[PDB]
Design a protein around this ligand. Sequence first.
Ligand SMILES: COc1cncc(-c2cnc(NC3CCNCC3)c3[nH]c(=O)c(C)cc23)c1
Length: 127
Amino acid sequence: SMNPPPPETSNPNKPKRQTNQLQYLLRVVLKTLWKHKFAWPFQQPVDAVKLNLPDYYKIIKTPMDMGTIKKRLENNYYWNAQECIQDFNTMFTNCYIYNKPGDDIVLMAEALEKLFLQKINELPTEE
Ligand SMILES: COc1cncc(-c2cnc(NC3CCNCC3)c3[nH]c(=O)c(C)cc23)c1
């Protein structure tokens, strides 16, 4: 089966900016989910080999994880906050697609998503 390369975390042909929303996404939103007790399985791409999940990248063709999101924020990969929020949504949806309901990992994703939405609700205004 084997893993794909991780998602892109840099792009030399994309302009860059630091904004209030992006800073909040790293310092408050990502930081808060990162330190959650359920965070670790989502802190890096799913290693289908080590975990023995050979069909993972057959089923999930748009992988995403918080390690990638963190690196994207640190590398100024996102221009719009929406890009980052979309990546979180993709991560959670992947989990709901690949795993079975009631799997420990699905409940963990549910709790993390609730927390995520709580924090996105207090995102500072665009400007
Ligand atoms: C360091 O990464 C991990 C740590 N702990 C757990 C996982 C993990 C394990 N199993 C998964 N799926 C199986 C659960 C039991 N039923 C068959 C599928 C996982 N699925 C996922 O989507 C993620 C993100 C982690 C994971 C990854």
